[PDB]
Design a protein around this ligand. Structure first.
Ligand SMILES: *[C@@H]1O[C@H](CO)[C@@H](O[C@@H]2O[C@H](CO)[C@@H](O)[C@H](O)[C@H]2NC(C)=O)[C@H](O)[C@H]1NC(C)=O
Lengths: 48, 64
């Protein structure tokens, strides 16, 4: 399995045309804010 | 480092806008003689640089 290719499935808004997003900021799914720590309702924005 | 290019008595006016990742630069130079503010008049700025940065910009700072 070549897990070196990544794609983003978590973002608060849809992209504009010709946009390139390199944000590593943790997606906030729940009401509780995520202060840089992932876990429950705090997910990494990239998937392999 | 995706791009690198190397090339009051005067008035320098500039327009900076970023639409769809394209940074468009307009400019116009003219000599002036005024120490209070911008002189009252009309002039047209012309484009010289169109740089496809693809970079989000929300704030800027002027260097002296
Ligand atoms: C450009 O960057 C700003 C941040 O400097 C973005 O504003 C953020 O937008 C997200 C939603 O996409 C919000 O969750 C953040 O709270 C916003 N932050 C601030 C400080 O405003 C803006 O959306 C970005 N625009 C583009 C074109 O990517």
């Amino acid at each position: 399995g070549n897990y070196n290719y990544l794609y983003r499935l978590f973002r608060k808004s849809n992209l504009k045309p010709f946009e390139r997003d390199i944000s590593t900021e943790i997606y906030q799914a729940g009401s509780t804010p995520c202060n840089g720590v992932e876990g429950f309702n705090c997910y990494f924005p990239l998937q392999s | 480092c995706t791009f690198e290019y190397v090339s009051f008595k005067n008035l320098r006016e500039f327009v900076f806008k970023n639409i769809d990742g394209y940074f468009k630069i307009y400019s116009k130079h003219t000599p002036i003689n005024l120490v209070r503010d911008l002189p009252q008049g009309f002039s047209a700025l012309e484009p010289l640089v169109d740089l496809p940065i693809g970079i989000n910009i929300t704030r800027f700072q002027t260097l002296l």
